[PDB]
Design a protein around this ligand. Structure first.
Ligand code: HEM
Ligand code: HEM
Ligand SMILES: [O]
Ligand SMILES: [O]
Lengths: 682, 677, 356
C-alpha cells in the first residue's frame, strides 16, 4: 500500500458523537436563540466554530495547472543503475519507491472541463529514501518559451482576457494567438497542443516528458545529459475536437473519473520510465542546443532506455488533503541528479518554491502529510506559521561547539550529501541575452508535422482552423499566417482557406522533409482494451434487455466496462437514455430489438429528449468510434445511413459483433470517416 | 458614469516604459546569466520581482457562488419612500445611487460552466450616501434550509464528493439527494432549481429575491416586514436541459459573455426593485412563519409595490480588481433597514464578515476600491494587514477628553445613526430549537401546481435525470417517499424512470392551490432586443448576399445576427466548425444553403460531418424558432420538419423575418416536448 | 507562542452568563486566531489539540493536517448511518446551555442601571490595604499622573479620584501641584474585606528565594562565603556568590550583579574592603557597584545583612543593625535572621507615609 505512511493521520468518525475542533461532544443542527423565535446568540460557540471552519475552507488554486487529479502508486527500478546515477531510488533491481502523480490541464481554473484543448501536466513525486524527487512534466516534450522570465507573458496571453475573464480554459482567442505569432518560439508546443496531445482520451493514454535536459551524476562525479520520458503501457489515444467539446459539457470530470474507475476496478495504469542519454561534449551536436526547451531529441539519434516502471494503484482518501494540497517542485532534487543551464528550468526552481507561500499561506507546507518525505528532516529551521513539530535541539545554528556539530554537514564524500556536477564551469560576460544556438523556431515544428499521419495532420490543421477563426483582429490572423508559412507553405494555405485570407507565397528557409518516430498517436493501435467503455443501447420492451445482459457479460470477460442503456432503470439497465451520451463510451452497440427506439413511437417518449438513441449512435459513428448492431438492430444502423460493411462497423450475431467490436477498440478511432483537404473537389 | 469614483486608481501603460513595481525603467525578457549559456543569477532582481508577483496572483475562490460575473450600473428611486423607510437612497424621487451587481451559480468552482443547473446568485450593492447597502439575493425566492448552522451540511452534500472531487457543478449525485431526502425542508428550493430557474437563458432574464423577511423602519421607529424583489424588464426565460449540457462545453462563458455584450452594445439590462409590505402582526397570519426562508409570500396575499429601477450600463475594466474582489455582506445595512429573527439570515451576518478574512487574507478588505463606500469612513480602527490610509486622529479611542469627542456617536436621534427596530423584544428560554411553525415542508412545493403542463414535465424530467445518477437504491427510495408527500403524481412519474414503485398516496399536504408570478413559460418576452439569430449560409452561389440582406433587416429590430459559412468569406461572422445552435436564440437557413445539408456541400473538410444539419436539428429539438428562406426549405425537409409547425417558418425573406421575430417572443415552442401519458 | 486560549473553550457542566464583557470575548478570541495563525486549522497544532478526540464534518482549510475517512461529511444523512451523531444533555454527554436561562425585554444597546456604581468597590479595595500598601498605590498614581502633559486631564483624574476618597485625591493632588478638591462623599465608606492585601501576610515558604552574597577574591572572604552559601541552600534558597572576578566558588561578577536579582543581600566577612577605598575602585566593575547593590537592597525593603567585620559595609551606607530587616553578627546569627526576614519579604518600615 503506497498510502501506508498516511494512515497515522487518518480520522475515523463512524460510531462517534459530534464534537467541536477542541473536543467535547455537541449537537450542531440548531442555533442557540434568545426565545422561541428569537435572534441567534453570540455566545453560540458551537455555531461559530462550525461556520468559521466552513468559511475558511478554500485555498488559492494553482496559478497554472489548477484543474487536475492524482493518485498514489509504486515505482519499481529494473536494475542497478549506479553506472549512470547515484540516485538511490534507481540503485538496485526491483527497488520500490512510493509515488504520487497528478495529471492536469494548464490554462483552466479549478472547475473547468477535463476535455478542453490544452497541454497536460504529468507530475510525479518519488518518495525516495534520500528525499523527495519530483519530475514535474507535461504530456508534450517541448515548451512554448526559452526563458523563464517570459512565463507570465505566455500565461497571461492564454488565460482569459483580464477585462471580462473570457474565455475559460482555451487558447482560441486574440491574446493567445497574438502571443504565438509575436513569440515564434511558441509554435512548436502549439502544434503539439493542436494535435491529439491537446485532447487525450485519458491521463492513462498520455506519454510524459521532463522536457528539460537534466544531468545524471555518479558517485565519482561524472555526469551525462538526460531526458526523462514516461511511456504509457495503455497506449496513446486521443479524441476528436467536436467530441471533446460535447464531453466538456456532458462530463467535465471525464478524465478524473477515468483514472479513479481504472484504479478502483483493479486495472491500475502503468508507465515505463525511460531516458535518453547524451555525452556532455555533444550538447550541441544534434542540430540544436540541448539547453533549449523548445526542442526534443529525435529518438533516431538517441534511443530510449527503460529504467523502471510506475504503477498507480491507490486512489486518494481525501482529495483536498492529498491531491489539492500537494506541492510539486523541480527544485525537489536528490543526490545523483543535477540541473542544466536551461534558462526555462533555471527560473522554475525559484518560482515553484515561492508560489507555495501563496497557496499554503506559510513556510511549513512540507510538513503537510502529502508533502512529507519518508527519509527524515534534520536541520536548524524553526518557527514559521503552523509549525507542526517540537524541536529538541536548542542550539539551532552551525557551526557550534555546544551541539557537537550536529546536525552535520553532508557533501559528495561525507553523508551522501547533494553536490553540483563538479566539472560545471561559467565562462563569459554577465548578460541578459539568449544564446544564438536557440534561434531556430521552425525546423522542429516542421519535423513534428511531417511525422504525423495524413488524417492526423488534418486534425492539426482543423484545430488551428477552429482556433484562429475566433481571432477578431485581422492583423493577428495575418501574423499567424506568416508564422505558419515559415513552418510549411501547405499548412499556411490550408489554414488560410478557413480564414478567408490569401494563400501566402513559399518561404522555404526552414522547409524540410525529415520525419521522426514516437510522435504520432493514430498510427498505432492500443496494446490493450481493458477498461475501455461500451455503451449498449437497448429497450425495456420485448426481449432486448435479456440479450443486452448476455452481450454485457461476455464483453466484461474481456475487461471492458459495459453500460446497458434503456428508457428507464429496469432490472439490468445501468443508465437511462436521458442520462446517456456517446462521449462516455469508446464503442456503441445497439442490442437486438432496440431498433424500435430509433424510429416511430419508440423514439418519441417523455423519458428522454427527442432523438436521443439516434443521436448517441450518430455521434459515436461521426466521432470515429467502433459501432455495431446485433441481429435485427441493424435497422438502427440503417436509420442513420450507416452501411454494414464500413470500416469499424459490425453487424451480425452476438458473437461476431463481440469480436468485431473488441478488434475495433484496438484501432480505437476509424480515420476513414474524416475528410482531408482536396477530398470534396469536383 | 457609474465607475466615476474608480477613475483615480486606473493605471494607463500606453506610451510608457516597463518598470519594476518600485519604479525604475527595465527590460524583463531575458534572465541575467553568468556567461553565454550560463545559469541565471540570484542577483537578477528584475526576474524575481516579476515572477514573485505572477507566483502570487491567485486568491481563494468564494466558498460558494465562486463562478459568476458582474457589472456597474445606476439605481433610480421612483419616489420619496420616507413614509415606509428612513433609508436615504429611497428618500427622494429620481434620486440615483451607483450600484454593482454580481450574478453567479452556487456549487461550481471558478471555471465551471455558466449553464450548469443550479440556484443562481443575484447580489446587488447600493453605494448610498449613508453607507453601502447590499441585497445579497438569489434568483429563487426560497432557500434549502431553515437555520444557518446547517449551511456547511447543505454545501458539502451538493459540492463534489470529498474522495475524488466528482461531480463538478452538479446536484446529480448520491450525497445531494441523500441530503435533499434526509432534510425535507430542502424540497422547495429543489423544485425551483429543477424548473426553468435552474437553467436560465441569461442573467438579464432572471428575477431576484432577498428571500429573507427584513424590516423597513421609518425615522420614528415604526417598522414593516418586507420582501425584496427584482423584476426583470427583459422577461424570464430558460433553456432546456439537453441544450444547457451541450452549451456547457461549447461555451462555458455563455452567461458572462451575454451580460458583457448587452452592455457593450448599448442594451443595458434593467430590473425594477419591488417590495411586499406587511405589518408585524402578519408574521404568522398566512399559514406559515415569515421568519422561515423555505417559504415565500404569495402575491395574492401581498402584491408587489415598485420602488425604483436599476440599470446595468458599465462593464468592469479589470475583472479581478472589481468583480473577483468585491465582498458582499448581508450585514452591509444602513439606517432605515433592520434584520428579522430569520435563523438563516441570523447566521449569514457572521459568515460573510468572517469569510472575507479568508478570501482577502486581512482585515482591510473594505479599503479596496470596489468595496469602498462613497460616504466617508470615520472611526478609531487602526493598523491591520495592508492598511492603506494614514490616520490623523492620534486619540483613537472613545470616550476621550483629548479628541473633543470626535468621531462622535450617532443613533436614532443624533447624526442619523443606525438603530435596531425599537419595538423588537425577546421572550422565552434560550434554546437550540426551531419553531413548530417551521414544520411544514411540503405544502409550498406543491409551486408545482402553478406551472404549465410542459413546465411541469421539465421539472419531472430534471428530477428523473438527476435521481437516475444516484447509485444507492435506498436513497432513491427515500427520495420517492418525500416527493410523494408533495404530489402522488410527481412521485409516480419520477418512479418510472427509476424503475421503482411509488408509495401509495399520502394526502396530508395535497392541495390544488395556485399562485401567480412563479412560472416562466406562461409568458412571452416583452422584448427581443439582444436575442441572437444564427443564419446558415454557404460561400457558394448567391447565398451570402441574401444572408447579408437578411442580417441587415434583422439587426433593425435590435437582434444580434451571426452569418455562418464554410470559411470567413466577406460578410461571414463565424465558420461552421466554430458554430453551434446553443449560441443562438433562432436558426435561419439562408436561401441556397440547402447545398450544405446534403450532397457534396455537406462533406467539406472545413467542418465536422453533418454540422449544418446538426445545427438546425439542435435548434428544432430544443424548441427554438427555426426557419428557411425560399429554396432553403429543402434543409427543413432534410430533417423531417414541416411548414405547418408552430415556430417553423418558410417562404420569402419578408415572411421569414416577420415569423422569426414573433417566434422569438414565444422563445420556446413547448409543443415539441412530450408529456407523460 | 503558538497556544491559542479561548473563553469559548467550554465543556459540559460549565456555561456562560450574560456578563456583557464575557459575551464579546467569545467572539474575539476565536476571530483573532485567524490573524495570529493565518488559517482555520490552528486547533490541530500539537499544543492546541485536545486529548479527547475530534469527530465532526469540518474539512479542508489552510494547513489541513488530517485525512478524513467519512466521505459523507454532512448531517443528516442516511449514507453515513448518522455518524458523527448528535449529542445533547441526555445522550452523548453533549454540551447544553443552562435549561432555565431566559431572555426577556426589548433588544437594547444599553447597560443595566445596576452597573452604575464605579466608586464604592475601588474605595473598598483601598480600605483593605495596610498603610504603606496604600502609600504604594498613592505613589504609583503620583508617578503615573505626573507624566500627563495635559492639565485638564490631570484635573479630570483628580475629580474622579475624589469620588473614591477625598484623602487619596488630596495626597495625589500634592504631587501634581493641583488644589485639594473638597469632599464628594456620595460613595465614601469605611468597609474592608479580606483577601486583597499582599503586604499584610508573610510568605508561607522561602524556597527558591534568592540571596546575593557580596564577597571578594582578596583574603579569606570567599571561603566564608562558600560556607554561608552551603547553609542557605539547605533551606531551599538559591545563592549567588559575587566577587570581582569568577574565582573558584564565584557565581557572578560585580559587573554583572544587581540587587534586583535577589530577595536578600548579605555581605560576607572581609568583603567590606570593596565598599570603600581601593577595593571599591577597580577596572573590573563600575565604580561604587558593591555599595550600590547594598544601598539598592536596603532601600527596596529587602533583608540585608553582614557577617562579622563586614558590618563596616552596613555602616558605610548609614544603615544600623537596630533596624528591622537588617542583621549583623556571626554567620549562624545572620542566616537565621535573613531566613526570618525572607518570610516578611519586604520591610515597609523603610518607606515614608504622607504625614507620618
Ligand atoms: C518544461 C516546462 C514546464 C513544465 C513541464 C511544467 C509543468 C508543470 C506541472 C505539471 C504543474 C502542475 C503540478 C501539479 O500537478 O501540482 C506546474 C505548475 C506550476 N508551474 Fe510549471 N511547467 C513548466 C514551466 C513553468 C515555468 C517556466 C514556470 C515559471 C517560471 C512555471 C511555474 C509553475 C507554477 C508556479 C506552478 C504552480 C505550482 C503550485 O502551485 O504548486 N512552470 N507546472
Ligand atoms: C437566503 C439564503 C442565501 C442567499 C440568498 C445567498 C446568496 C449568496 C450570494 C448571491 C452570494 C454571492 C455573492 C457574490 O456575488 O460575491 C453568496 C456567497 C456566500 N454565501 Fe450565501 N446565500 C444564502 C445562504 C447562505 C448561508 C446560510 C450562509 C452561511 C451561514 C452563506 C454563506 C456565504 C458565503 C461565506 C459566501 C461567500 C461570500 C464571499 O466570499 O464574499 N450563504 N451567497
Ligand atoms: O507550469
Ligand atoms: O450562499
Amino acid at each position: 500500500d503506497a498510502r501506508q505512511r498516511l494512515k497515522e493521520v487518518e480520522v475515523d468518525d463512524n460510531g462517534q458523537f459530534m464534537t467541536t475542533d477542541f473536543g467535547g461532544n455537541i449537537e450542531e443542527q440548531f442555533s442557540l436563540k434568545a426565545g422561541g423565535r428569537g435572534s441567534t446568540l453570540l455566545e453560540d460557540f458551537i455555531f461559530r466554530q462550525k461556520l468559521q471552519h466552513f468559511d475558511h475552507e478554500r485555498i488559492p488554486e494553482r496559478v497554472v495547472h489548477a484543474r487536475g487529479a492524482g493518485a498514489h502508486g509504486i515505482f519499481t527500478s529494473y536494475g542497478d543503475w549506479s553506472n549512470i546515477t547515484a540516485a538511490s531510488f534507481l540503485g538496485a533491481k526491483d527497488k520500490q519507491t512510493p509515488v504520487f502523480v497528478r495529471f492536469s490541464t494548464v490554462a483552466g481554473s479549478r472547475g473547468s472541463a477535463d476535455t478542453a484543448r490544452d497541454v497536460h501536466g504529468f507530475a510525479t513525486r518519488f518518495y525516495t529514501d534520500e528525499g523527495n524527487f519530483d519530475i514535474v512534466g507535461n504530456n508534450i516534450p517541448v515548451f512554448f518559451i526559452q526563458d523563464a522570465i517570459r512565463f507570465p507573458d505566455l500565461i497571461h496571453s492564454v488565460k482569459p482576457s483580464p477585462d471580462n475573464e473570457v474565455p475559460q480554459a482555451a487558447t482560441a482567442h486574440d491574446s493567445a494567438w497574438d502571443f504565438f505569432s509575436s513569440q515564434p518560439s511558441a509554435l512548436h508546443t502549439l502544434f503539439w497542443a493542436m494535435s491529439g496531445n491537446g485532447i487525450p482520451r485519458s491521463y492513462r493514454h498520455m506519454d510524459g516528458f521532463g522536457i528539460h535536459t537534466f544531468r545524471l551524476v555518479t558517485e565519482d562525479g561524472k555526469s551525462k545529459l538526460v531526458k526523462w520520458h514516461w511511456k504509457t503501457k495503455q497506449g496513446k489515444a486521443a479524441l476528436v475536437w467536436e467530441e471533446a467539446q460535447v464531453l466538456a459539457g456532458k462530463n467535465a470530470d471525464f478524465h478524473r473519473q477515468d483514472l479513479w474507475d481504472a484504479i478502483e476496478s483493479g486495472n491500475a495504469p502503468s508507465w515505463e520510465l525511460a531516458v535518453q542519454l547524451i555525452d556532455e561534449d555533444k550538447a550541441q551536436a544534434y542540430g540544436f542546443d540541448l539547453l533549449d526547451p523548445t526542442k526534443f531529441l529525435p529518438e533516431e539519434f538517441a534511443p530510449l532506455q527503460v529504467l523502471g516502471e510506475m504503477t498507480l494503484n491507490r486512489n486518494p482518501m481525501n482529495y483536498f488533503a492529498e491531491t489539492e494540497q500537494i506541492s510539486f517542485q523541480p527544485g525537489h532534487i536528490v543526490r545523483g541528479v543535477d540541473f542544466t543551464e536551461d534558462p526555462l528550468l533555471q527560473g522554475r526552481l525559484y518560482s515553484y518554491l515561492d508560489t507555495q507561500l501563496n497557496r499554503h499561506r506559510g513556510p511549513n507546507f512540507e510538513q503537510l502529510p502529502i508533502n512529507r518525505p519518508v527519509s527524515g528532516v534534520h536541520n536548524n529551521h524553526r518557527d514559521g506559521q503552523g509549525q507542526a513539530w517540537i524541536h529538541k535541539n536548542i542550539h539551532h545554528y552551525s557551526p557550534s561547539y555546544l551541539n557537537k556539530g550536529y546536525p552535520a554537514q553532508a557533501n559528495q564524500t561525507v553523508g551522501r550529501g547533494f553536490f553540483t556536477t563538479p566539472g560545471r564551469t561559467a565562462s563569459g560576460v554577465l548578460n541578459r541575452e539568449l544564446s544564438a544556438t536557440f534561434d531556430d523556431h521552425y525546423t522542429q515544428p516542421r519535423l513534428f508535422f511531417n511525422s504525423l499521419t495524413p488524417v492526423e495532420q488534418q486534425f492539426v490543421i482543423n484545430a488551428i482552423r477552429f482556433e484562429a477563426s475566433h481571432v477578431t483582429n485581422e492583423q493577428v490572423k495575418k501574423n499567424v499566417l506568416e508564422q505558419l508559412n515559415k513552418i510549411s507553405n501547405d499548412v499556411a494555405k490550408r489554414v488560410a482557406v478557413a480564414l478567408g485570407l490569401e494563400a501566402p507565397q513559399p518561404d522555404p528557409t526552414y522547409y524540410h522533409n525529415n520525419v521522426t518516430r514516437g510522435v504520432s498517436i493514430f498510427n498505432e493501435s492500443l496494446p490493450t482494451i481493458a477498461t475501455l467503455r461500451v455503451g449498449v443501447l437497448s429497450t425495456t420492451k420485448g426481449g432486448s434487455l435479456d440479450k443486452a445482459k448476455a452481450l454485457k457479460e461476455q464483453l466484461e470477460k474481456d475487461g471492458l466496462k459495459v453500460t446497458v442503456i434503456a428508457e428507464y432503470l429496469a432490472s439490468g439497465v445501468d443508465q437511462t437514455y436521458s442520462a446517456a451520451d456517446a462521449t462516455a463510451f469508446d464503442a456503441v452497440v445497439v442490442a437486438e430489438g432496440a431498433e424500435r427506439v430509433f424510429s416511430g413511437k419508440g423514439a418519441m417518449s417523455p423519458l428522454f429528449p427527442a432523438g436521443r438513441p439516434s443521436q448517441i449512435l450518430t455521434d459515436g459513428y461521426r466521432w470515429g468510434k467502433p459501432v455495431a448492431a446485433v441481429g435485427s438492430a441493424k435497422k438502427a444502423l440503417q436509420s442513420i445511413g450507416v452501411e454494414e460493411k464500413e470500416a469499424g462497423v459490425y453487424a451480425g450475431a452476438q458473437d461476431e459483433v463481440i469480436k468485431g467490436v473488441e478488434e475495433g477498440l484496438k484501432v480505437f478511432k476509424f480515420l476513414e470517416r474524416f475528410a482531408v483537404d482536396g477530398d470534396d473537389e469536383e
